[PDB]
Amino acid sequence: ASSLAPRQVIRDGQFITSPNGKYKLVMQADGNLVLYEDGTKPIWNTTPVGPGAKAVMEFNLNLYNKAGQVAWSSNVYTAYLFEEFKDEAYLNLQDDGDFGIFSDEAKWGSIVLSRPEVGVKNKIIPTGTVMVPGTEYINGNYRLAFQGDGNLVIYQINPQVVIWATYTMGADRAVVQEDGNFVIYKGTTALWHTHTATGMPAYLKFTNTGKLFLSQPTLLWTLKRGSLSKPPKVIPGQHGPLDTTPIWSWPHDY
Numbered sequence: 001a002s003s004l005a006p007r008q009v010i011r012d013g014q015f016i017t018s019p020n021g022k023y024k025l026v027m028q029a030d031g032n033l034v035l036y037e038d039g040t041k042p043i044w045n046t047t048p049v050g051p052g053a054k055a056v057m058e059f060n061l062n063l064y065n066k067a068g069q070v071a072w073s074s075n076v077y078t079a080y081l082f083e084e085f086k087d088e089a090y091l092n093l094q095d096d097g098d099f100g101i102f103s104d105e106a107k108w109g110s111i112v113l114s115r116p117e118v119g120v121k122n123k124i125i126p127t128g129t130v131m132v133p134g135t136e137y138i139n140g141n142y143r144l145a146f147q148g149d150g151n152l153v154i155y156q157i158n159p160q161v162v163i164w165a166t167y168t169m170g171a172d173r174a175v176v177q178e179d180g181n182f183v184i185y186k187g188t189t190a191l192w193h194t195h196t197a198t199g200m201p202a203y204l205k206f207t208n209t210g211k212l213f214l215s216q217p218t219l220l221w222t223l224k225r226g227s228l229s230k231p232p233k234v235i236p237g238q239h240g241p242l243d244t245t246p247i248w249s250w251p252h253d254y
């Protein structure tokens, strides 16, 4: 795990580790949140608040002492801290040892929403994913399938019901692009797309409620760079089954 999901809590020796293995962020039993290099050299810390402490990803990364007070915080500079942001924001620790907080807004959906769904669980489909006939994803009682015929379809599994579909007949592939657009293709012809080309890479969220959203990463803060007012271009990191969030990396200088 190189990341923290929204609301995720770490404590009592729990940690995350950069993709390359070199950096480790650990919430120690003594209540000190520490960044280690090569498992032996502490390069940054909050300093300890004592036992019974925890750190939690809730828009900010916040460190709580046993008395429930906030002893350290990322202190991300936003103007409006909507309590629905706390279920959306996640954290990556990257290969140069910097760590950063993302809160991404949806840019496209298979359906327009009245209001967020509560306790929805998302299957991340990351940047550079190339779907191909026979590709499918299962999340709960819903199936997302790129089919032989080229249709991208969401099915309710039980009972079988079509919930949504692109009707892109003949398409050969579907691509979650680095430019921020999700596009379905016959050869080089775009049959369908999400109109989300922004130069910021895309990922998809397929829900256990039978819906599909495209978001793009919005880096808000890093330990080394403090709060950011504009979001810098990031690059997709290595996404596998162990990771519950998108994975990103961001450059050293500008």
Ligand SMILES: OC[C@H]1O[C@@H](O)[C@@H](O)[C@@H](O)[C@@H]1O
Binding pocket: 107, 108, 109, 110, 111, 112, 194
């Ligand atoms: O983002 C909301 C909607 O916008 C429309 O133009 C279409 O592209 C739909 O596919 C989408 O559900």
Ligand SMILES: OC[C@H]1O[C@@H](O)[C@@H](O)[C@@H](O)[C@@H]1O
Binding pocket: 123, 136, 137, 138, 139
């Ligand atoms: O990403 C490939 C696979 O990942 C697993 O979680 C599930 O979503 C599968 O349905 C999917 O085929």
Ligand SMILES: OC[C@H]1O[C@@H](O)[C@@H](O)[C@@H](O)[C@@H]1O
Binding pocket: 147, 149, 151, 153, 162, 165
């Ligand atoms: O309406 C959705 C249906 O569309 C049809 O054209 C086919 O692609 C089916 O596989 C799919 O279930």
Ligand SMILES: OC[C@H]1O[C@@H](O)[C@@H](O)[C@@H](O)[C@@H]1O
Binding pocket: 191, 192, 193, 194, 195
């Ligand atoms: O061709 C562009 C496509 O973009 C989609 O998001 C919708 O607007 C489709 O109805 C359309 O076919």
Ligand SMILES: OC[C@H]1O[C@@H](O)[C@@H](O)[C@@H](O)[C@@H]1O
Binding pocket: 177, 179, 181, 183, 190, 193, 197
């Ligand atoms: O309209 C379809 C096209 O939109 C473009 O701006 C890019 O994202 C292309 O990759 C995509 O094929």
